[PDB]
Amino acid sequence: ADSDINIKTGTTDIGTTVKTGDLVTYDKENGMHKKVFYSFIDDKNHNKKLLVIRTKGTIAGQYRVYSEEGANKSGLAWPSAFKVQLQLPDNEVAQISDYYPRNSIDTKEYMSTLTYGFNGNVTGDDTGKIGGLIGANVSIGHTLKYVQPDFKTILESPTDKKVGWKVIFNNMVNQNAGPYDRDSWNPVYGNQLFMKTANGSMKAAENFLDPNKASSLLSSGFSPDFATVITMDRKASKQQTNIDVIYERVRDDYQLHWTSTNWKGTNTKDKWTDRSSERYKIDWEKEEMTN
Amino acid sequence: ADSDINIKTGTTDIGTTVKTGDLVTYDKENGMHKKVFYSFIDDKNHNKKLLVIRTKGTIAGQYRVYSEEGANKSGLAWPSAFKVQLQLPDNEVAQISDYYPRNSIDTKEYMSTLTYGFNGNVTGDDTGKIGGLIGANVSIGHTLKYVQPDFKTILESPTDKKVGWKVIFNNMVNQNAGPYDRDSWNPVYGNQLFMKTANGSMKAAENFLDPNKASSLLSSGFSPDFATVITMDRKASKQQTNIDVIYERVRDDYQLHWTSTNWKGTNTKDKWTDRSSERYKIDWEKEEMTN
Amino acid sequence: ADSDINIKTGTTDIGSTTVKTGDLVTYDKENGMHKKVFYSFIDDKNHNKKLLVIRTKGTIAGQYRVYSEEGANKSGLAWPSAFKVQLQLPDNEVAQISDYYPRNSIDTKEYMSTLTYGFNGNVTGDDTGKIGGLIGANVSIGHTLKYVQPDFKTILESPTDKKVGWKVIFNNMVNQNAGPYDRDSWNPVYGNQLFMKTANGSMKAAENFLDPNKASSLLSSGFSPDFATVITMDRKASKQQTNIDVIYERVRDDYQLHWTSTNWKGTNTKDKWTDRSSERYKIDWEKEEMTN
Amino acid sequence: ADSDINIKTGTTDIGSTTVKTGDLVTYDKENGMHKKVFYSFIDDKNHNKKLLVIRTKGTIAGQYRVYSEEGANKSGLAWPSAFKVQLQLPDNEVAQISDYYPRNSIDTKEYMSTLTYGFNGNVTGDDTGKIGGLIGANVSIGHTLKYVQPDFKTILESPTDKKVGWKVIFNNMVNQNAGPYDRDSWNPVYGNQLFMKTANGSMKAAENFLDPNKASSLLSSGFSPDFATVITMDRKASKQQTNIDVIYERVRDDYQLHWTSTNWKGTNTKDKWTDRSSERYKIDWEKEEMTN
Amino acid sequence: ADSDINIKTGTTDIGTVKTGDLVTYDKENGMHKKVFYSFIDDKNHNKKLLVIRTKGTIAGQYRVYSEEGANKSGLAWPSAFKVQLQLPDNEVAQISDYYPRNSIDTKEYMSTLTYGFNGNVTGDDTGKIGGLIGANVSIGHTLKYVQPDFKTILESPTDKKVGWKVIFNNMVNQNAGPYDRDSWNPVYGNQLFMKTANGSMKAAENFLDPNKASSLLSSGFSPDFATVITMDRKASKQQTNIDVIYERVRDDYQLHWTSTNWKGTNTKDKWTDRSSERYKIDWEKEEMTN
Amino acid sequence: ADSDINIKTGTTDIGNTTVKTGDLVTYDKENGMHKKVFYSFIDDKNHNKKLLVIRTKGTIAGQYRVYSEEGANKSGLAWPSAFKVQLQLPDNEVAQISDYYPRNSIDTKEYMSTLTYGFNGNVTGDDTGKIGGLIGANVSIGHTLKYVQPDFKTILESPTDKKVGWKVIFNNMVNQNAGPYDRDSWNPVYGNQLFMKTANGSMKAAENFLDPNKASSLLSSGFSPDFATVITMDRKASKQQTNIDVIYERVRDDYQLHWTSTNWKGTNTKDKWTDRSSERYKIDWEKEEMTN
Amino acid sequence: ADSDINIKTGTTDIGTTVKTGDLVTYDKENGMHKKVFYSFIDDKNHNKKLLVIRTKGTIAGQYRVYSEEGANKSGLAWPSAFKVQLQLPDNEVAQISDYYPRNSIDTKEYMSTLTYGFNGNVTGDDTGKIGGLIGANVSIGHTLKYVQPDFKTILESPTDKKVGWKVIFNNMVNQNAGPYDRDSWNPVYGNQLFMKTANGSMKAAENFLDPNKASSLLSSGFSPDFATVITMDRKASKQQTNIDVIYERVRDDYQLHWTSTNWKGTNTKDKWTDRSSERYKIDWEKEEMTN
Structure with a gap:
């Protein structure tokens, strides 16, 4: 913060x-609501003209059988990654x-933990014995404790021309069991990630986990x-700039099959990829952004 | 926020x-109090005219035998979902x-957790023995911990013409027992979601859980x-816009029946749906919203 | 909030x-009720309506009493199981x-x-060379449910465009590090021990009630x-006066203790008594004043 | 708050x-009471009534003493079980x-x-080919209750439109990592162990009272x-002067220790002594000043 | 706060x-005594105000x-810090x-209340x-609370004299205890500041290093x-004398050897250091001097 | 803060x-490095010197790769064990x-x-009247140590009046609910299991490295x-121009997996590779601008 | 704060x-970066002129073999105490x-905790026995819980002429073991504070704990x-004041030696002391501080 270096707060910022x-x-x-909110900031005391692009909207999950x-045997498509990416052409x-x-x-x-203890006893009965x-006793314990989200938010390695985030599936609770991930494997049940029941009396399609009891990001988005x-730079000859904005959904394939005794699930990674791209024009003189 | 990117706070927003x-x-x-609070924001430095629509009011629970x-045998109607939806016509x-x-x-x-320990003991008696x-010993422990609300609030996959929320029943604690949900099943008791007593001596209607001990959303709403x-867009020719707002309640059917040895409950999903829709007129020039 | 939708904070609210x-x-x-109405007339010319904020405060005494x-x-204790507040506009308004x-x-x-599993090895012996x-x-499965419960639940009752109300109801309560008990607690031997002071005592039933100092203060002080x-x-409305009825009420339960020749037993009757206090206020929208 | 009902914060309050x-x-x-009254006359013309805010502060000494x-x-210890502050307008006001x-x-x-269930298998053996x-x-079902309690409870007494008051009462207290004990704690051997230092030692009864430094600071210092x-x-009232009574009081209990020939036994008598300090203030609404 | 009674915040104060x-x-007495004072004269307040902040530092002086x-050895340590302000009665x-x-x-x-059941079947090669x-049934009671090394206590004030005492409560000793001034063990006595139970050094050596003890004890x-x-502005005498006293009460912690181990004994309030000083308050000039 | 020393907040800080x-x-x-310098020239007349604040941001890619x-x-995985940022002024400045x-x-x-002690009794018998x-x-003493560990530690390196720098170094990390492991973890059978996916599987060595999605995101994305x-x-200094060198660098370790005919065994070599990116900036104190 | 005594916040302060x-x-x-930030405050409504002297910079750890x-046999120098002291001449x-x-x-x-319980059990076999x-059972437990920093920050007993702080070594975790301090002793291992391994095959110098796994204050500083x-006092005749500022590092000596069966560590306290002093001139009239 500003005060940590003995300067009045808000002093070193652009304002x-x-x-x-x-x-x-x-x-x-592609089922994507894409919204771009932009702000042109022209502080004369700043050596550069700034454009802040906030990428919002919603990418639908489209968790579907x-x-x-x-x-x-039945198949379920589900979103394992949401991605947002901005890229300037290199000539910019x-x-x-x-x-x-x-x-x-x-x-x-x-x-x-280290615990140690002692115990004594006296025993007896009616035969005078x-x-x-x-x-x-001694006992040594080790406990590890940590928090993990259903999805990880990660900033991809940026350049001075391209940047992006990926929101990726980590693990999830399945009816108070698990948690499971894309790589969970059980010899009897395989991947139990979206499995509703271990064994039941229905068609495969019914046995998928009800999206209402799963991460709401999977379905609603x-x-x-x-x-x-x-x-x-203000002195550039060309005060126009193209920029590409991309919304993307990566879908995995979760299959349920019947092994004559119980259910077994199998998951294939990055099966499908829906990519929605749009190009915007940035006018630094007019200070307006269009598509 | 703005300060995280070296800019004065409140700078990049619409004001x-x-x-x-x-x-x-x-x-x-439909027992629905529907209130709409709206705000027209017309910032000249913003490329578009804004309307904020807040949908409030109260959708009654109508939890009843x-x-x-x-x-x-008896039947209880209870609300499993509350919904709000706003929809613009496509030609808008x-x-x-x-x-x-x-x-x-x-x-x-x-x-x-990983624990391992050792113990020694020496025994004896009066026979000089x-x-x-x-x-x-070694022991491995795994613990999972998480919070679940009685109702889940979910934003439905939006488009640029339609948006909505659904507040759905998740699970619920029943007299220090459970928690139970719409799919809980017990071979003896079936679905004990709203079951008061397992095997008492009263009419079926009496045996439904007192709404005062259940989620207040169920009854009061x-x-x-x-x-x-x-x-x-300010330059649009038609500066008038219709918008339809829908309130919905979906009610499930929880029935209790006596099996001569016990009570057993059964729950039917989405049996009834109360849908209350209204149309509003948005005048962007006059900056006023009416019905 | 506004900042969540890229708008300057306080922009969308009614204030200018x-x-x-x-x-x-x-x-x-x-009825032992202190009733305060704090009201605010807000007439924002940029708002499509006249606004009146009615804050209903004061205090409804508990009146927890033998x-x-x-x-x-044998003795009986009257206690407040519900506090309620109701505002109601006449339909012609x-x-x-x-x-x-x-x-x-x-x-x-x-x-x-929790899932825990373990193994253990062990060797035995003695002086006979044996x-x-x-x-x-071993394996073990554990399940824990955890949640917080208030002594009283605050509920907004299903509103209309003419009437609104709240009910603050007894939920459950701790009785001397025991329980918690509620209005429906039952023990075959002791019944409902909710406000039971002791299980065994040489004393009057009246003296065997839980000291209100050891119970929720809402029960006694209120x-x-x-x-x-x-x-x-609406500003265009012809009659710029509006009558409104405000009701405060208390619902009291009957908690009785009787002696079974060996011990104490409690019984609770729900909603035995109801104290209802109603009053009418006149709202004058032109004069911007509310009266009684 | 105001933002909860779509209104600019601080708009509906008395200040604008x-x-x-x-x-x-x-x-x-x-009576060992420091009594301070801090008052504020607020006259907001947009408010239908004149306001006086009376803040009652100071300190009521504990006077925890043998x-x-x-x-x-045998010895006796007087201790504060309740502090009270009360304001009262005459009805004619x-x-x-x-x-x-x-x-x-x-x-x-x-x-x-908590619901836990588990299984274990085991094989044992011997050198005799045995x-x-x-x-x-295994199955086991557990219930846990958890809650926070202060040494003293702060309670608003049932107010009227003429009198109001608070009481800060003794609830329970820890005694040297034991207890907590309260005014009704009883042990057949030791009686009430609330303020006893040792169970069995060789001193006078006066010596065996708990050091106030190890007890709640409210008990002694106050x-x-x-x-x-x-x-x-009401501004339109004819008489723009109002009398108001402010009362501070301390309720002391009697905690006795006696020797019973083998151990110490403690007994507590409730509400034995009461120190009450009352004063009248004159409120002049026109001069906007409060005097004594 | 003010907003709790439907009034704009900051309204009911002196501003x-x-x-x-x-x-x-x-x-x-090893006492750094600082007085910060503020004269507040609000015309809309019925009386003139003086805020006196008593700061500085009273050294701990934890020493053998x-x-x-x-x-045999003796350790002096501070069991109480005290601050007192006193107006003469005729003021x-x-x-x-x-x-x-x-x-x-x-x-x-x-x-907690827990109860359970368990079953088992056993057997061997003899067909047995x-x-x-x-x-099983089990009841548990757990008490939990936080206590500081020192308790900060406001002494019963009057309208002429006020004071605080910051007193030693209890303290952790090398992952053991906590101990207080009254802790007693029949073989070791009071182990409050004892470094080792049994070690061949001088009695002075066996006292706990102040660096592992509460810093209030040593540095202060x-x-x-x-x-x-x-x-009151109408008062005839617009001068007021006021005495401010800083105090330190020191306990005596003795360690002695009993030919097998160390034993500690603690005697309360053995020494008292009192530093008193008088200030002159001028309400007209609005200044406080010595 | 200033209020802690009896001064108005923001008084003693730097800020017509x-x-x-x-x-x-x-x-x-x-070197896969996005390097951004945000600078601020602060010239407070009431301050005895001109100030330049240099904020080093951007992103150093992790480049976690087989x-x-x-x-x-046999396979080898290069991973980032330290990120570093360094600023240096020449001595003549x-x-x-x-x-x-x-x-x-x-x-x-x-x-x-923890110190726990207990006693237990039990009576036994059978049908033979025995x-x-x-x-x-029993008695038992427990000692528990508990502390929080970040995946990477942020260290400010010993500065001088001419050069300063930070190093963000790998500390330890959880591997699929196991560990946490660090660069020196060793198992006689498995060696260093830090980035090992499975103990014994049937795939190529390259496929047995932990998925970067399940590892610290600093390792891969950066x-x-x-x-x-x-x-x-100093304003009075003759040359109001100052050169400054800024260095971003990444230190990569070598984590190899090999098959021992029964299972996988991991080995980690420290500081095998070092990627260094330096840039020279000119600071102009008169023109109040910074360039490269 | 002021609001605690019925006064508007910021009223009683200087400004x-x-x-x-x-x-x-x-x-x-001595490897010490020493920075002094000073502020002269001359409030006319305050009875005295004020100077705030903030001592900052960095004292290097110099954790070194x-x-x-x-x-x-080998020796490691490590910082056991950092100190900062300001001293006015007595005649000031x-x-x-x-x-x-x-x-x-x-x-x-x-x-x-106080816990007590009961249990029953019935036994039998195929011989009709x-x-x-x-x-x-009854058991009483006592648990103590508290936080201890790696280093203690202590304000030394000040006077009206001298003030100082000492930041002293308390204890430290050694590879999930310990914590150890300067007085830790094991009959077998001696002091295990900065010991890497109990028994291995390297030079003594190699067996010291990697500074990366110890408190960063030890090495980086x-x-x-x-x-x-x-x-x-404004009316003082001499409106100039010299002040001495001292930065100081106290280093302990941790030696490792091999006893032919395992490693044993020994620590000698306050072995070395690096003391760095500087004198500053305070001009109260010109409101400036110089060196």
Whole structure:
């Protein structure tokens, strides 16, 4: 913060009138509500002109049973990753200056235990017999404790021309069991990730986990909220800039099959990928952004 | 936020005088108090005119014993879902830009424990006999921890013309037991979701759980608090826009029957649906919203 | 909030506007109720309606009291199981109930699952040169449900555009590090021990009730409502006066203790008594004043 | 809050006006009470009534003290079981008690249910070719109750439109990692162990009382009230003067220790002594000043 | 707060002020005594205000004071820090307020009831078959609470005199205890500041290093107490004398050798260091001097 | 804070003062480093020196990658064990490094001691009228140490008045609910299991490395520095231009997996590769601007 | 705070224009970056002129293997205490008024548990034999819980002429073992504080704990952040004041030696002391501080 280096708070920041806007596009085939909120910041005391692009909207999860192959085997398509990406063409003079959020250093809680004890006893009965025991004990414990989200938010390695985030599936609770991930494997039941019952009396399709009891991101979807800061030199001859904005969904294939005794599930990674791209024009003189 | 990217706070946002209003309607048949609070925001430095629509009011729960087939079987209607939906006609130029709340990523706390120990003991009695014993142990522990609300609030997959929320029944604690949900099944007791006593001596209607010990959303109801942001192009020819708002309640059927040794309950999903729809007119020039 | 939708904070709210506020205080002696109405007239020209905020405060006494004493074997305690507040506009009124606070909040619960498994080896022996051996294994499944419970639940009753109300109801309560008990607790031997002081005692039934100092203060000293109701009124309306009835009421249960020649047993009758205190206020929207 | 009902925060409150404040200090020597009244006259023209905020502060000394000594087998300790502060308008007054802080809050408690079940297998053996085995199973169901309790409870007494008051009462207390004990704790051997230092030692009874340094600081050094009362006055009233009575009081219990020939036994008598300090203030609404 | 009674925040308070610093060092008593004062004269307030903040630092002076050979030694340590302000009785000015005050402690209590059943079947190669069916019940009570190394206590004030005492409560000793001034063990006595149970060194060596003990004991305690004094403007004598006293009470912790192990004994309130000083308050000039 | 020393907050900090800010961005492709400098010139007349605040941000890619594959029994994985950022002024410069953020924070640990003791009795018998009894006792002492560990530790390296720097180093990490492991973890059978996916599987060595999605995101996608350096300059200095070198660098370790005919065995070589990216900036104190 | 005594917040404080400055000096021999930030406050409504002296910079750890006596014995120098001291000459009329931080009162969490139980059991076998068992138990537990920092920050007993802080080594975790301090002793291992391995095959110098796994204060160093407030009477004749500032590092000597069966460590306290002093001139009239 500002006070940590003996300077009055808010002093070293960029603060000037700002020009803002909203641009909304809906991709029907890809089921993506894409909204770009932009702010043009022109601080004369700052050596660069700034454009802040906040990418919002919603990418639908589209957790859906897609095929029913008889009554033994059925297939479920589900979203394992949501991605948002911004890219400047290389010929551009404008640069990607900053981004939010970034990758945070995860933490874990470790705990070590040492217990030792002693115990004595006296025993007896009606035949006048009497016994005794003296025992001792030591025990060492190690406990690891940590928090994990259903989905991880990760900032991809940026350049000065391209940036992006991926919100990826980590693990999930299945009816107070698990947690399971894309790589969970059981010899009897295989991958129990979206498995409703271990054994029942129905067609395969019914045995998929009800999306209401799973992560709501899987079905109803994920709403990005990422910020990109682009800087522009005022003396450039060309005060126009193209920028590409991409929303993307990666879908995995979770299959259920019947092994004559119980259910077994199998998951194939990155089976499908829906990519929705749109190009925007940035006018640094007019301070407006269009598509 | 703005300070995370080296910019003065509150800079990049939309801020100008605002035109606000209230529209209240009460649907008696559906037992729904529907209130719409709206705000017209016209910032010249913003590329579009804004309308914020907050949908509030209260959808009654109407948790009730509706049928009485003697003293052996009875039926309880209960609300499993509350829904709010806003929809623009497709031919409209205005777009759904933003919404609150959105879907949150759940988290869970995991714990791993590894313990190992040793113990010794020496035994004896008055017959001069001496015994001895040396033992060792290892133990592995896994603990999963997470929070579940009685009802889940979910933002449905939006487009730029339609948006909505569903507040759905998740699971619920029943008199220090459970928690139970719509799919809980016990071979003896079936679904014990709203079952008061397992095997008492009363009529079936009496045996439903007192709403005072269940989620207050079930009976007294749920008060929506959702916001939609619509953007409008100032240069559009038609500066008038219709918008339809739907309130919905979906009720499940929980029936109790006596098996001569016990009570057993059965739950039918989405048996009834109360749907209350109203149309509003949005005048962007006059900056006023009416019904 | 506004910042969540890229708007300057406080932009979308009703404020730009002079407000006319007031206090009306009434004490109902027979019903033991202190009733305060704090009201605020907000007339924002940029708002499509006139606004009145009615904050219903004050305090409804608990009146937790031993009411009957049929000797030393039997006694009865009257206690408040519900506090209620209700506002109601007549149907012929043009003014509408627009909003209210508080509302019903969604409860949550903390769930915890444990799976533990272990092995142990062991060798035995003694002075007769004898040697024994032991290999054991174990597995264990644990499930924990965890949640917080208030002594009283605050509920917003199903509102209309003409009437609104809250009910603050008894939930459950700790009795001297035991329980918690509620209105429906039953023990075959002791019955409902909710306000039972001791299981065994040489003393009157009246003396065997739980000291109100050791119970929820809402039961005895009482509960102080803090509810807000927002009324909207159309400026074009012809009659710029609106009558409104405000009701405070208390529902009291009957908790009786009787001696079974060996011990104490408690019985609770629900909603035995109801104290209802109603009063009418006149809302003048032109004069921007509310009166009684 | 206001933002909860779509209104700019601080809009509906009384402030949108210059305030006249003051301090009145009195010390009751015989009753050991420092009594301070901080008052504020608020006259908001947009408010239908004049406001006086009376904040009652100061400190009521605990006066935890060994008062009598009957030999070395029996001794008595006076201790504060309740502090009380009360404000009362004469009924003939036109001014009304409008609001008060703090009020009674709804307590909560944390409940837990646990269900565990497990299995274990085991094989044992010997050098005599002997072979043994066992297969066991287990179920266990647990209930946990968890909650927080203060040493003293702060309670708002049932107010009227003329009188209000708070009481800070003794609840329970830890005694050297034991207990907690309260006024009704009883042990057949030791009686009430609340303020006894040792169970069995060789000293006078006076010696065996708990060092106040190891007890609640309120018991000895005392309690500092911080309560606010809000009085409303109609401007159109003929008599713009109002008398108001402010009362501080301390309730002391009698804790006796005696020797019973083998161990120590403690007994507590409730509400034996009561120190009450009353004073009258004159409220002049026109001059906007409060005097003594 | 004000918003709790439907009034705009900051309305009911007193809102130019004249402030000052007086510093004195008592070398003999090892006390750095600082008074920060503020004169507040609000026309809309019925009396003139003086806020007196008593700060500075009272050194702990945790030290081994005596060495009676190699079997016996004495440690002096601070069991109480005290601050006192006193107006003479004939003064018209009154003590109106003070901070901090005494807070009500809380404790966390939790009760558990567990009951279970267990079955088992046993057997061996001799075709023998055994069984057992068992049940269990258990009740647990848990008490939980937080206590500071020192308790900060506001002494019963009057309208002429006020004071605070910061007293030793209990303390952890090398992952053991906590111990207090009254802890007693029949073989070891009071193990409060004892380093080792049995080790061949001088008695002075066996005292706990101040670096592993509460820093208030050695380096000291910094008071931060405020007193609010009110004065009537119509008073004839617009001067007021006030005495401020800083105090340290030291206990005596003795270690002695019993030919097998160490034993500690603690005697309370053996020494008392009192540093008193008088200030002159001028309400007209709005200044406080010495 | 200032209020802690009886001064109005914000009084003693630096701030008629106008600040001259700017951004410099370069991307080193060979080293995969997005390097951004945000600078602020602060010239407070009431301050004895001109100030320049340099904020080093951007992102150093983790570049967690399988780099060699010697069949299906041996593979190598290059991973980032340290990220570093360094700023250096040449010796001949009169300008000085005055301050920096973050600095090294003091770690803490929670210690716990438990002492439990108990007694138990039991009576035994059977159908042969035999009667037995046993009475036992136990004592136990427990010590628990508890502390929080980040995946990477942020260290401020020992600064001078000419150069400053930070290193963000790998500490330890959880591997699929196992570990946590660090660069020196060793198992006689499995070696270092830090990034080992399975104990014994049937795949290529390359396929047996832990999925970067299940590892610290700093390892693959990378680390984003956020460091501040405060440089002071005398106004009276002759050369109001100052060169400064900024270095971003990544230290990569070598984690190899090999098959021992029964299972997998991991080996980690420290500081095998070092990627260094340096850039020269010109600081102009008169023109109040920074360039490269 | 002021609101605690019925006064508007910020009323009783000092506030006026302030004159601030920076003095940076680097002690190479002692490896100490020493920065002084000063603020002159002259409030006319305050009875004295104020100078706030903030001592910052960084004292390097210099955790280093210094000696090598073959391959069986070695020595490690480590910082056991960092110190900062400010001292006014006794003849000065200017006074040390205040200081931050001060000593905080530490706390601990104590909990006592009382548990008691009963159990029954019935036994039998195929020989028609019958057995019985009735048991009871009681147990009392005492648990202590508290937090201990790696280093303690302590304000030393100040006067009106001298003030200082010491940041001292408390204890430290050694590879999930310990924690150990300067007085830890094991008959077999001696002091295991900075010992890497109990018994291995390297030179002594190799067996010291990697500074990366120890407190970073030990190696990279400590950054002081201390404030001293000095008052000056405006009417004092001599409006100039010299002040000495001392930065100091106390290093302990941790030696490792091989006893032919395992490693044993020994630690000697306060072996070395690096002391770096600088004198500053305070001009109260010109409101400037120089070196």
